[PDB]
Amino acid sequence: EFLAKAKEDFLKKWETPSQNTAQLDQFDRIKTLGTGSFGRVMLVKHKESGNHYAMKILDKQKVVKLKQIEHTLNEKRILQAVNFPFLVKLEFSFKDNSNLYMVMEYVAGGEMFSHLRRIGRFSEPHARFYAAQIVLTFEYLHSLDLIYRDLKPENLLIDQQGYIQVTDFGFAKRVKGRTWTLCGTPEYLAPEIILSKGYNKAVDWWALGVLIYEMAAGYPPFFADQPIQIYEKIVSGKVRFPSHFSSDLKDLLRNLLQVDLTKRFGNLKNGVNDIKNHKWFATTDWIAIYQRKVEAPFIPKFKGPGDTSNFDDYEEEEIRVSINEKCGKEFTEF
Amino acid sequence: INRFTRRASVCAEAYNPDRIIHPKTDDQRNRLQEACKDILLFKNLDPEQMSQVLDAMFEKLVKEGEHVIDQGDDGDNFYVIDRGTFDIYVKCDGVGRCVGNYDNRGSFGELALMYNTPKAATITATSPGALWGLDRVTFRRIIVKNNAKKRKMYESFIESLPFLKSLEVSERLKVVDVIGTKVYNDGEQIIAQGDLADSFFIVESGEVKITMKVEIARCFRGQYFGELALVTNKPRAASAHAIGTVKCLAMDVQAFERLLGPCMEIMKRN
């Protein structure tokens, strides 16, 4: 019962979105946290509050040149207009001559990708703790008719509390009918996307399969060095499970990694419950997880405010801002 | 390790559904067609989706030593060889190395049909040849426009069923996602008079003929049948046969119920 409010609290935000709520000179460009295109998340020192944040930088020209304008307003409209424990909180957004900027709550834990490769693989219970969180988020998201469409360890951050934060909404979209864009990450694409069938929520769930398989197995289920070959394997759906998988696990996977939509978990009559109620999730306290009254497997090792020990290092370029507005027409809705 | 390399996202140009014909010889067609059918993006398409795409594939012919495509030089173009011979070489550094051959057959660059991916080798024409290109955007469009059309409205169909009026739209869409196809040929039997009724059909084109042993009914495009299969599994009322060349939609019911529950639970709604 509580939930339905979420919806309204969202619709409100969504039609009348926060617009321009700061400018570059209130933060101190500390360190590059990540490169994209274009690109380059920065840890920043906010001058007054001293509060620390992460600011996604976006060169209007690249986006524009890479036919990515829609995806970008999508990212933002959506992302201010939403609210969840495991969704990254957006503090300010604004623009200038050259760039687009989004300031989110800085998640210091680093990437689950980072951890995974380093560590090797996750214990079922360990993976299960993350998985649980993702399940919930997708639930809340689909409730509002939003798909994420870009699940992967590289897009999942850990907070100091050991919990998860979903990170890159560049593909998130509000879809009521059925949408058509071929995007995501090769290793994580649902067959219906590969094949230009048109789709909605089930693609998110397929992704869920892939993620869990990767967490526990320490690698993804569909693999090759040539992308097409990955795709081929995806579209047949047939996948080996590593020797060391609980029976309860291999089962669940078979139900998420279902090419047959009439069979894929998440897309069925009882929708998402077929999942929460699945046996693997037995030990899972969904009410408790929500509130974060569960204890995290792993705690990121953090030192002091604004530590970036958990992130890789890139070579810092300096932010240039043209004397001339660029692509201003295009990003007005921003 | 480089298991530590991140997996970058990929994305094609968009298109929401809400003319182009390059000419070629009867032969030329069959040849290309059977050159593509084994390719992931082509193994699938219904013969007209297939057909609109041969249509869309343009002719490019080349002077010898012409750079058919250059390594690093872009890709939204996939090419199948019609005629000609070809050298392949890649400059990995540094070293510049002939790799392999193409002798009047073969294709390359289909990944370009999904999202942009810069050719990895340079293809040089050894001698006079010609090939068939296909841009990505032109292709996504053909394929999407189609399913979009050849999906909603399948629907005047699904929602033309008196058994299904009480569905909500999303639920109907769920069914559109998965409903399958069957082409039947004149005289080939569709439904048998005694078989475990497991699915309902809708003539996409042609006509079906239901009979009990003397013709009880005849179905044309738009109309359904074997519908009782939704409410009662009991053995087939009658039999269905193909008058001419008929194409039908086919929905196995177990499948159906997994998605929406028992059909009757739905009728009871309102």
Ligand SMILES: Nc1ncnc2c1ncn2[C@@H]1O[C@H](COP(=O)(O)OP(=O)(O)O)[C@@H](O)[C@H]1O
């Ligand atoms: N709030 C944040 N806190 C800390 N690091 C972040 C945050 N947001 C993004 N990053 C870092 O930036 C990287 C890329 O961000 P992302 O939004 O995925 O950009 P893109 O998808 O364009 O590559 C992430 O992998 C992460 O390491």
Ligand SMILES: [Mg+2]
């Ligand atoms: Mg990303």
Ligand SMILES: [Mg+2]
């Ligand atoms: Mg992105």
